[PDB]
Design a protein around this ligand. Structure first.
Ligand SMILES: Nc1nc2c(ncn2[C@H]2C[C@H](O)[C@@H](COP(=O)(O)OP(=O)(O)OP(=O)(O)O)O2)c(=O)[nH]1
Ligand SMILES: [Cl-]
Ligand SMILES: [Mn+2]
Ligand SMILES: [Mn+2]
Ligand SMILES: [Mn+2]
Ligand SMILES: [Mn+2]
Ligand SMILES: [Mn+2]
Ligand SMILES: [Mn+2]
Ligand code: NA
Length: 328
DNA sequence: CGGCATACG
DNA sequence: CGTAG
DNA sequence: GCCG
């Protein structure tokens, strides 16, 4: 039929059930704002099943046998098919709680727990936060100052410009190091809200200490509007040129040794749901523990060597999916 | 019923 | 607590 | 919320 794990099926970026999947994703997001990770996962998984179907769902009949469709998710789809709207979804959409939690958690440096505390304190707007700046972290101050630019979609044209700049700094920091585009743009997205890069070097060990050297060089070139500072992940805000001005862009930089590069490439290419499902599959179906550093057999107490993403899918007994089919 | 990814800053 | 896919 |  339809397999139960998202890593077992191709999921393209564009598909035939966009409206249905978007509605279920609203309910998933709302569940996350209420701390119900289980409900969030079911609604995310149900949405992803629809993304993987070969044609539009027209009749409730067509949901029979699909994994992750039970009474609740089927009723949502039934209302959308019959009336074009689901009352529960529309109620969530217009709710003050949903709109405020969405606004607050979109802030770089603000998670669900912080947003919820602010909501309970009575805060509702960005200007509310700006009027009490002593309660903010430096990271949150940065996220709030740059929030407007960070709400503007990053375009593929923007990505090519950023990659050349990152390569320049990486080349001075360590000749021979390479820069690979990851995240949503590697999956074929035409827009995004950040750019993700993975950096390595072909000689194992030479990447040790690389990211501080890369960051200092970017910072000396005036391109870093914010970053946290030894480390291997950097979540920063870049200054990106624009016609007669510039805009702030979120950029994630990650370093891995070449021995781990296939695992890090897999992990950082996503999607987020794809990776959660793949790690769940590995552990629950194969008894293997997967992360962005490796794949561990806890019985033999050994790590799998991988030279490619293809190797990792083979180790796990899964058909290979290119990045553009990992859009779970 | 228990489980729900798995890390680093 | 934040961040990431 | 759903699966096994
Ligand atoms: N400031 C701001 N942030 C936004 C807005 N819309 C979304 N975001 C943030 C919230 C999320 O953390 C993030 C989602 O970005 P993307 O959809 O590009 O996904 P992400 O990069 O998380 O994953 P991906 O690399 O595609 O697998 O963007 C907005 O209007 N303003
Ligand atoms: Cl839950
Ligand atoms: Mn229900
Ligand atoms: Mn009706
Ligand atoms: Mn991204
Ligand atoms: Mn990112
Ligand atoms: Mn590491
Ligand atoms: Mn994200
Ligand atoms: Na946030």
């Amino acid at each position: 039929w339809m397999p139960a794990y998202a890593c077992q099926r191709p999921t393209p970026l564009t598909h035939h059930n966009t409206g249905l999947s978007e509605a279920l994703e609203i309910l998933a997001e709302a569940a996350g704002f209420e701390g119900s990770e289980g409900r969030l996962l079911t609604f995310c998984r149900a949405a992803s099943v629809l993304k993987a179907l070969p044609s539009p769902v027209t009749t409730l009949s067509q949901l029979q046998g699909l994994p992750h469709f039970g009474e609740h998710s089927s009723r949502v789809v039934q209302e959308l098919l019959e009336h074009g709207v689901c009352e529960e979804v529309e109620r969530v959409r217009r709710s003050e709680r949903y709109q405020t939690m969405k606004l607050f958690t979109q802030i770089f440096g603000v998670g669900v727990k912080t947003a919820d505390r602010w909501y309970r304190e009575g805060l509702r707007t960005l200007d509310d936060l700006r009027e009490q700046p002593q309660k903010l972290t430096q990271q949150q101050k940065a996220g709030l100052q740059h929030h407007q630019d960070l709400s503007t979609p990053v375009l593929r044209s923007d990505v090519d410009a950023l990659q050349q700049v990152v390569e320049e700094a990486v080349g001075q920091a360590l000749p021979g190091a390479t820069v690979t585009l990851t995240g949503g743009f590697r999956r074929g997205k035409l827009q995004g809200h950040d750019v993700d890069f993975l950096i390595t070097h072909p000689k194992e060990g030479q990447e040790a200490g690389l990211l501080p050297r890369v960051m200092c060089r970017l910072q000396d070139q005036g391109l870093i509007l914010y970053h946290q500072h030894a480390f291997e992940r950097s979540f920063c805000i870049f200054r990106l040129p624009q016609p007669g001005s510039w805009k702030a862009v979120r950029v994630d930089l990650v370093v891995a040794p070449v021995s781990q590069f296939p695992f890090a490439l897999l992990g950082w290419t996503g999607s987020k749901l794809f990776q959660r499902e793949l790690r769940r599959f590995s552990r629950k179906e194969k008894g293997l523990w997967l992360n962005s550093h490796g794949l561990f057999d806890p019985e033999q107490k050994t790590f799998f060597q991988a030279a490619s993403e293809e190797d990792i899918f083979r180790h796990l007994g899964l058909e290979y999916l290119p990045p553009e089919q990992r859009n779970a």
